[PDB]
Amino acid sequence: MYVKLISSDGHEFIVKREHALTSGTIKAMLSGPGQANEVNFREIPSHVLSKVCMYFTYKVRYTNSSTEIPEFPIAPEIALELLMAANFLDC
Amino acid sequence: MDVFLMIRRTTIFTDSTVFELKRIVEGILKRPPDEQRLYKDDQLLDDGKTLGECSQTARPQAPATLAFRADDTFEAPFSSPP
Amino acid sequence: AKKKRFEVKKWNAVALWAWDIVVDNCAICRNHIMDLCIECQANQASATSEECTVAWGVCNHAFHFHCISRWLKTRQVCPLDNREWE
Amino acid sequence: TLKERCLQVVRSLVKPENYRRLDIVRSLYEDLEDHPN
Amino acid sequence: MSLKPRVVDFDETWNKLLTTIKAVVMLEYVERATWNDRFSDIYALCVAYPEPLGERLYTETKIFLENHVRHLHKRVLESEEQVLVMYHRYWEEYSKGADYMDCLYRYLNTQFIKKNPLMEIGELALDMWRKLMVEPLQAILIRMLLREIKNDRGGEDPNQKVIHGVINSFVHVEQFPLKFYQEIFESPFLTETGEYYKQEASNLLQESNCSQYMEKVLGRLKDEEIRCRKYLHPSSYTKVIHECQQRMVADHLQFLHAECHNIIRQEKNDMANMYVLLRAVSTGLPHMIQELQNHIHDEGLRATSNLTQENMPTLFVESVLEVHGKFVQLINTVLNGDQHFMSALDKALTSVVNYREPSVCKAPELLAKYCDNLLKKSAGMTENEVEDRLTSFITVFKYIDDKDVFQKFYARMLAKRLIHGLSMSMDSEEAMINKLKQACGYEFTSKLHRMYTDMSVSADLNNKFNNFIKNQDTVSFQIYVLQAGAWPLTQAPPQELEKSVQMFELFYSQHFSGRKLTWLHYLCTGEVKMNLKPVAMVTTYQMAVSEVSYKELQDSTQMNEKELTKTISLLDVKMINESSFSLNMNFTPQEMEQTRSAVDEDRKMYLQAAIVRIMKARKVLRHNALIQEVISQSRARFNPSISMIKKCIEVLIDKYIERSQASADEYSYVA
Ligand SMILES: [Zn+2]
Ligand SMILES: [Zn+2]
Ligand SMILES: [Zn+2]
């Protein structure tokens, strides 16, 4: 019903499990046997995981809806790291 | 009214008055609302006014913004690569 | 009572109605003048449910209209009297 | 998708002659040269 | 470290990662955090040396798969004939771990889909399970598995969980998914249960009675389906039973078909099971249906035969209706049916209602006197019921072969029933013609219809003459007038009396354009009741005067002695009564005999109409081919005499038809 997502910098990110089930890797993590829910990450920094989560919220909320679809701002120095963790999370 | 937030201390992603908002905060954190205050960087949010009055100022892909109470009355940043 | 009185009260009768010929069934074909002819009793098409088409002739012999009409096309002479019929 | 659209945002600020030297991800620079418009 | 590409050791992540793999296998306990670490411990491997390296992880993983499969092959081989038990714990301790490993290698394959033999690690692990089953186990196990199904009769029950896991374990592995299941298991089980039910088919058939055999095999099938649903996959439910019903039934069907003759001539359950079993057979039903037809022919004919000399059509109608009710109860009750059996009933009773004694066939006339008899006054029965009895009569009418003579007779039935005020209800006698009309059509009930209308037209017409009577200067009877083509009644051939007909007849000449009326005298009444209130039969016989004898006034007025001599009837009944005749002191076979010909000429007219109707639409026919189509057309009127159609042709070639030369039969049409 609710899962946690921890970054390597220490910032926690609690959100419902289905909001985290978007990326195949995380739905493969909660599929981990044991019962297991709380999840951590020892290689993804916070300034990247925050952007990944803010990316989740949009296309979880706004998809196939009725509105003019805007663009997506990405910082020109984290875009490398955001691209890397984007390759990691299979999303 | 249909607004996303960035309530921080921990950053939880959830989504009508301020009291029911403190219920949503109480969802997993499991603490009564009388132990929580809400500030917008310079101000105090009252419970007598609704959420829409206190919006669509926070897009869903980058929304914006919690001072707990220790005894009785409420008291008391990401990285950057080179 | 009386023996020979015989007062004649209520009478009754019954009678058929046909057209002004004998007829022996409109000799052109061998059906009755008031019963459907060959093309109509066989055609199974539209027709009046009680009198298809009774056609009197000026020669004072009445036939079915389209019997004496088809016969009228193939040969103008009247069948019964070898003259011109109408 | 976050991966492919971050690729698209990066390709707007990286020369086509620097798709291998950036050393972003060694299983990804083989994809920096496969995504036209 | 960070997610930046770091060249990491090859055993550091491989020890804890490997032990984590072995912990996921068999559903052993794995920690909530190490599982959260393995994805990093694989992404770090698949990136930086400074080249991808998943090709190693795939091969090593396949090696561990092989070693594990062979270990459980030595454990499974150790199990003496219980290879399926440790094999059940093996698969049920292997599937969830396999899927969890497939989820554990997501990034291993998302950068590997662009490079594919034997990708999809999950499909490859299940491929290794296939490498466990291709072993002589596939020869052993099924032999050891069917042995637990071979114990079918009284050999129950093992764990449906274990065997259902073993058999269900075959339809799980595929990139034609049912191929392995069909080849390895479905053919041997199929043919072996085929042998089983052949052997036990002959074993049961030697043991039991016929009805006991059918009861037993029905129970056996009802159990067999539940068994197949306990053990097998649904993809064979239709097939497996199809073998069973093919060997226990339809493999001996001569026997069942032989006992059918007996069983359908017993009103007694065994016959219901007979239908049930014969129905699922290639050819099971036809003999049974045939025998029900013959049965109903026999019992029916038997009912309609017991009434000879008893001069009752009511018993004949009620008897045929009795049979029909009997067998409709039968067929609807026990046979889940039907339409075939119902049609057999219809054919049988079709042949019952037509007698061929030397007459002939005595059915239509009786079915005319049933209506005429059931419509008279009889001052008796009760209405609101006569229409019910006619509603029953609709069927016995339905089966008549010759509706022709039924029509021609009911015409005179209705004629005498109207022209002499014999009917009981105009509103009802109309509804009868409504019944005949909704049974045959417009052509069949036309003369009847306007034959019924001439009574209303005659009433209104009588009113109009009542007005025209006193409508001039200065100035007692009522008349029926008839359309003269719809009425079979004839004149049957004396001078005007008190007169008064012409003072009335000028009305019918002025009201209609050119209608010629002819007066019928055969059916005219008078005024009865001498004065001496309480028989009084005087309607015809218009003589009305000494007192004089019969042969002493042979010199009557102008009238012929054809029917006059038969009516001189008044000196016979009451009022005149050769020696001495004193005044009173107080108060159809031959018709039908010569009626039998109008049916003949009406058939000639009807078949003539068929000849023209057919020869116009289609252009030319050979002499044979026009016939069988005249027959096809006039089917429901009567069976026409081929002796009549040919002469009818030879009559119509004198009027509409021409024929040139008979080398090949040929008949053309002329306008
Ligand atoms: Zn006509
Ligand atoms: Zn003429
Ligand atoms: Zn004519």
Side-chain angles (χ1 to χ4, degrees), chain A residues 1-41 43-61 63-66 68-91, chain B residues 1-7 9 11-45 47-68 70 72-73 75-82, chain C residues 1-40 42-84 86, chain D, chain E residues 1-57 59-75 77-89 91-117 120-128 130-215 217-232 234-354 356-373 375-396 398-416 418-423 425-436 438-468 470-494 500 502-503 505 507-636 638-646 648-666 668-671:
Chain A
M1 187 66 204
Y2 291 100
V3 298
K4 186 183 287 185
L5 295 174
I6 298 169
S7 66
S8 67
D9 291 331
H11 292 88
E12 293 179 353
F13 295 100
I14 297 169
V15 68
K16 290 175 71 175
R17 64 182 294 165
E18 184 177 1
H19 293 88
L21 295 175
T22 62
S23 66
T25 186
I26 296 170
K27 71 180 180 67
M29 296 179 76
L30 294 175
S31 178
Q35 184 177 2
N37 291 319
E38 292 179 353
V39 174
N40 62 5
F41 294 100
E43 291 82 3
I44 297 169
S46 66
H47 65 278
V48 177
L49 183 63
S50 66
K51 292 182 181 180
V52 175
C53 295
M54 293 184 286
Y55 180 76
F56 288 166
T57 61
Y58 182 78
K59 290 183 180 180
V60 173
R61 186 266 186 189
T63 186
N64 290 318
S65 66
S66 66
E68 293 179 353
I69 297 169
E71 292 83 3
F72 295 99
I74 297 169
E77 187 176 3
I78 300 168
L80 295 175
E81 294 291 327
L82 182 63
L83 180 61
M84 295 176 69
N87 191 0
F88 177 75
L89 294 173
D90 292 331
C91 64
Chain B
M1 187 66 203
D2 292 331
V3 176
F4 291 165
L5 294 174
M6 293 298 290
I7 297 169
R9 185 176 177 87
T11 300
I12 297 169
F13 290 168
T14 60
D15 61 357
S16 66
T17 61
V18 176
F19 183 76
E20 294 179 353
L21 183 63
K22 292 182 181 180
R23 295 290 184 183
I24 301 299
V25 175
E26 185 177 1
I28 188 167
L29 294 175
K30 295 180 177 67
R31 292 183 66 187
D34 290 331
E35 293 179 353
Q36 293 179 356
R37 291 181 182 270
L38 293 175
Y39 295 99
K40 182 175 72 175
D41 291 331
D42 284 326
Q43 293 179 356
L44 188 152
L45 294 174
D47 291 331
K49 292 177 71 68
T50 62
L51 294 174
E53 293 179 353
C54 294
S55 296
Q56 65 182 357
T57 61
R59 290 182 179 178
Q61 70 274 17
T65 187
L66 182 61
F68 294 101
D72 60 357
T73 60
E75 66 182 2
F78 295 99
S79 296
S80 179
Chain C
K2 291 181 174 66
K3 288 183 179 292
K4 57 177 73 174
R5 186 188 64 250
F6 287 168
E7 61 185 1
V8 177
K9 289 183 180 180
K10 297 180 182 179
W11 189 64
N12 285 315
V14 169
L16 299 172
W17 64 265
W19 306 109
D20 284 329
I21 314 170
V22 175
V23 56
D24 285 331
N25 300 321
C26 65
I28 295 172
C29 65
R30 196 176 66 246
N31 296 115
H32 193 274
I33 192 66
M34 199 66 204
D35 193 74
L36 294 175
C37 64
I38 299 168
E39 289 85 3
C40 291
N43 195 1
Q44 295 175 356
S46 65
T48 301
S49 295
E50 290 83 5
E51 180 178 359
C52 181
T53 305
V54 174
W56 289 271
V58 177
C59 64
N60 201 0
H61 285 285
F63 287 102
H64 293 168
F65 187 77
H66 51 279
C67 293
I68 196 166
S69 296
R70 179 69 68 192
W71 181 259
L72 186 63
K73 289 183 180 180
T74 187
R75 187 175 179 179
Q76 296 294 322
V77 299
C78 184
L80 291 178
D81 292 331
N82 291 318
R83 293 290 184 183
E84 184 177 1
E86 292 180 353
Chain D
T1 61
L2 184 64
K3 181 178 178 180
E4 185 176 1
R5 286 186 180 272
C6 287
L7 290 171
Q8 293 177 356
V9 173
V10 170
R11 292 186 183 94
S12 66
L13 294 174
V14 173
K15 290 183 180 180
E17 296 84 3
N18 194 359
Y19 288 165
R20 185 181 293 171
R21 293 179 181 177
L22 291 175
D23 292 331
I24 299 168
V25 172
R26 288 90 171 95
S27 66
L28 181 61
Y29 74 92
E30 295 294 328
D31 290 331
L32 291 173
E33 295 178 353
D34 289 331
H35 294 87
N37 190 359
Chain E
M1 293 299 292
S2 178
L3 56 84
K4 290 179 71 68
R6 301 291 180 90
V7 177
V8 181
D9 292 331
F10 64 95
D11 288 332
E12 181 179 1
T13 62
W14 183 254
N15 288 319
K16 185 69 176 68
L17 189 150
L18 188 149
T19 60
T20 302
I21 298 296
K22 186 175 175 67
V24 174
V25 178
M26 291 179 70
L27 294 175
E28 294 292 328
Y29 177 71
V30 66
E31 295 178 354
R32 290 182 179 178
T34 61
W35 181 259
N36 294 319
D37 292 331
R38 297 286 79 78
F39 285 164
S40 296
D41 291 331
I42 296 169
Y43 179 77
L45 294 175
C46 294
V47 174
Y49 178 68
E51 297 174 353
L53 295 175
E55 184 178 1
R56 181 178 177 179
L57 182 61
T59 61
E60 294 292 328
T61 301
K62 186 173 181 179
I63 296 168
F64 181 75
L65 293 173
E66 182 179 1
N67 291 318
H68 188 75
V69 170
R70 288 185 180 273
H71 183 273
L72 277 71
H73 178 73
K74 186 66 181 293
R75 175 64 64 85
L77 184 63
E78 181 180 1
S79 297
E80 193 275 331
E81 293 179 354
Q82 291 182 356
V83 184
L84 55 87
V85 176
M86 290 298 291
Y87 182 74
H88 179 73
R89 299 292 182 184
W91 181 67
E92 190 173 1
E93 289 180 353
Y94 181 75
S95 66
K96 294 181 176 67
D99 186 74
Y100 288 164
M101 291 185 286
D102 193 0
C103 294
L104 186 62
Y105 291 163
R106 183 64 59 85
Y107 184 77
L108 182 63
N109 296 115
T110 190
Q111 293 297 109
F112 186 75
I113 189 167
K114 66 181 181 180
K115 292 176 71 174
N116 222 201
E120 284 87 5
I121 301 298
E123 179 66 26
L124 190 149
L126 294 175
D127 191 1
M128 300 305 292
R130 185 178 178 89
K131 189 174 181 179
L132 189 150
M133 292 305 295
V134 174
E135 301 296 328
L137 297 173
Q138 66 182 357
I140 297 169
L141 290 177
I142 58 94
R143 290 178 183 175
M144 303 302 105
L145 183 62
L146 59 87
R147 186 181 65 83
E148 293 179 353
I149 297 171
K150 182 177 73 175
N151 292 319
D152 190 358
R153 56 182 292 166
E156 302 298 327
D157 56 354
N159 293 114
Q160 67 180 357
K161 179 173 69 179
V162 175
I163 297 171
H164 182 74
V166 174
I167 297 170
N168 195 2
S169 178
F170 291 168
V171 180
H172 194 273
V173 178
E174 180 62 27
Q175 182 179 2
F176 52 95
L178 296 174
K179 183 176 174 66
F180 185 79
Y181 175 76
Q182 184 176 1
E183 293 180 353
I184 300 298
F185 185 77
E186 187 174 1
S187 295
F189 183 79
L190 185 64
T191 61
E192 186 176 2
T193 58
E195 288 290 328
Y196 179 75
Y197 286 100
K198 180 181 177 182
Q199 296 296 108
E200 189 175 1
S202 295
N203 289 319
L204 290 173
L205 185 61
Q206 186 179 3
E207 181 180 1
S208 297
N209 193 359
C210 183
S211 66
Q212 297 176 357
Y213 176 75
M214 295 183 287
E215 189 74 27
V217 300
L218 187 64
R220 290 291 297 162
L221 294 174
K222 183 67 174 67
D223 291 331
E224 183 67 25
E225 185 175 1
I226 297 170
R227 181 174 296 279
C228 295
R229 297 182 187 273
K230 288 183 180 180
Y231 292 100
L232 299 177
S235 65
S236 296
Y237 291 171
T238 302
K239 294 181 176 67
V240 176
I241 297 170
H242 183 73
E243 179 66 26
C244 296
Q245 68 180 358
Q246 191 69 43
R247 296 291 183 268
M248 299 176 75
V249 184
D251 199 1
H252 307 285
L253 57 85
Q254 287 185 355
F255 181 71
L256 293 174
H257 290 88
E259 293 292 328
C260 289
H261 181 277
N262 188 1
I263 296 172
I264 56 92
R265 295 183 188 273
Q266 164 53 255
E267 301 293 328
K268 180 70 175 178
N269 191 359
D270 301 334
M271 184 172 69
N273 287 317
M274 180 63 74
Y275 175 78
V276 174
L277 292 174
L278 291 175
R279 185 179 67 189
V281 173
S282 67
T283 61
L285 291 172
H287 188 272
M288 184 177 177
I289 298 168
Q290 184 66 255
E291 289 297 329
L292 185 60
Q293 179 180 358
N294 297 116
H295 179 196
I296 299 168
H297 180 275
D298 286 327
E299 181 176 357
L301 194 154
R302 188 172 183 85
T304 67
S305 67
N306 198 359
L307 303 176
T308 61
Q309 191 177 2
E310 194 177 3
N311 65 11
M312 291 298 171
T314 61
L315 278 69
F316 174 61
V317 179
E318 290 178 352
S319 66
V320 178
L321 296 172
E322 183 178 0
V323 176
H324 191 274
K326 177 71 181 295
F327 288 103
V328 170
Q329 291 178 356
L330 180 62
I331 297 170
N332 285 319
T333 300
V334 299
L335 297 177
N336 189 6
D338 201 1
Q339 209 282 328
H340 297 91
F341 292 106
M342 294 297 292
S343 180
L345 175 60
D346 290 329
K347 296 177 184 178
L349 292 175
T350 299
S351 180
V352 173
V353 72
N354 295 113
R356 305 175 185 92
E357 292 183 353
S359 176
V360 62
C361 66
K362 75 181 174 65
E365 183 177 1
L366 293 176
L367 295 173
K369 292 300 295 294
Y370 182 74
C371 299
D372 185 76
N373 192 2
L375 293 176
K376 298 293 179 68
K377 187 179 264 77
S378 68
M381 290 181 70
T382 302
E383 288 185 353
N384 197 2
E385 181 183 2
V386 177
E387 197 275 332
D388 289 330
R389 302 292 178 90
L390 295 172
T391 300
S392 296
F393 175 76
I394 298 170
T395 301
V396 177
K398 176 179 70 176
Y399 289 108
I400 302 169
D401 193 1
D402 287 330
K403 297 179 179 68
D404 188 2
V405 181
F406 172 66
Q407 183 180 2
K408 286 294 292 181
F409 281 165
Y410 185 65
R412 289 180 61 88
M413 300 297 106
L414 185 147
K416 294 179 182 179
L418 289 179
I419 306 299
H420 297 287
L422 293 173
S423 179
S425 296
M426 294 293 285
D427 194 2
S428 179
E429 184 175 0
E430 184 179 2
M432 179 60 206
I433 302 169
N434 190 0
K435 294 180 175 67
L436 293 175
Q438 191 176 3
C440 294
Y442 282 166
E443 181 182 1
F444 188 76
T445 60
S446 68
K447 290 185 178 181
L448 279 71
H449 181 74
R450 292 291 179 183
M451 186 173 177
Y452 169 75
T453 300
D454 287 334
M455 298 302 104
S456 177
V457 173
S458 178
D460 186 73
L461 188 65
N462 283 318
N463 293 116
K464 288 183 180 179
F465 174 71
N466 289 120
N467 192 0
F468 183 76
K470 295 184 183 179
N471 201 0
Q472 35 249 64
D473 263 344
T474 64
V475 178
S476 66
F477 75 116
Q478 292 178 356
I479 294 175
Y480 293 100
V481 176
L482 298 74
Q483 191 172 359
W487 289 89
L489 289 173
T490 61
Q491 68 279 16
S500 61
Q502 170 55 41
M503 68 173 288
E505 187 175 2
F507 169 71
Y508 199 81
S509 68
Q510 291 182 356
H511 186 273
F512 290 106
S513 65
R515 293 186 180 183
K516 186 274 298 295
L517 61 83
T518 59
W519 287 94
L520 293 175
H521 298 89
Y522 184 74
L523 301 176
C524 297
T525 66
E527 187 60 26
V528 302
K529 183 252 186 67
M530 286 290 291
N531 188 0
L532 293 174
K533 290 183 180 180
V535 178
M537 189 277 288
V538 55
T539 62
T540 59
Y541 306 158
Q542 302 84 17
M543 301 302 290
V545 179
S546 297
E547 186 178 4
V548 184
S549 296
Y550 71 95
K551 194 67 180 293
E552 293 178 353
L553 286 178
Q554 186 180 3
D555 58 356
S556 66
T557 60
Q558 62 183 2
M559 60 184 72
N560 192 358
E561 292 179 353
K562 290 182 179 179
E563 289 183 353
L564 179 63
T565 188
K566 295 180 177 67
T567 61
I568 300 299
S569 180
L570 183 61
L571 56 86
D572 184 74
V573 177
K574 291 177 71 68
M575 294 178 184
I576 297 171
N577 191 0
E578 61 186 3
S579 65
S580 65
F581 294 161
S582 66
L583 291 174
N584 193 359
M585 291 296 105
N586 193 2
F587 295 162
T588 59
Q590 187 176 2
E591 295 292 328
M592 303 302 105
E593 291 175 353
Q594 282 82 18
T595 302
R596 293 180 182 177
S597 67
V599 178
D600 188 75
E601 186 173 0
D602 286 331
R603 288 183 178 178
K604 290 186 282 187
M605 301 297 169
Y606 191 79
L607 294 176
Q608 180 176 4
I611 300 301
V612 174
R613 184 183 65 249
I614 295 168
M615 286 298 289
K616 286 177 71 175
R618 65 184 70 247
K619 291 182 180 180
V620 177
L621 293 175
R622 64 185 291 268
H623 177 77
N624 213 203
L626 180 61
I627 305 168
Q628 308 296 322
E629 184 179 2
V630 180
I631 312 300
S632 177
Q633 297 293 322
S634 61
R635 46 94 65 85
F638 57 92
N639 282 317
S641 298
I642 305 298
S643 298
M644 300 302 291
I645 296 170
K646 292 182 180 180
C648 186
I649 296 299
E650 295 294 328
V651 171
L652 272 70
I653 59 92
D654 291 330
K655 303 292 184 181
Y656 302 105
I657 298 168
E658 184 181 1
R659 291 178 178 177
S660 296
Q661 186 63 255
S663 295
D665 290 331
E666 186 272 331
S668 179
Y669 181 74
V670 177

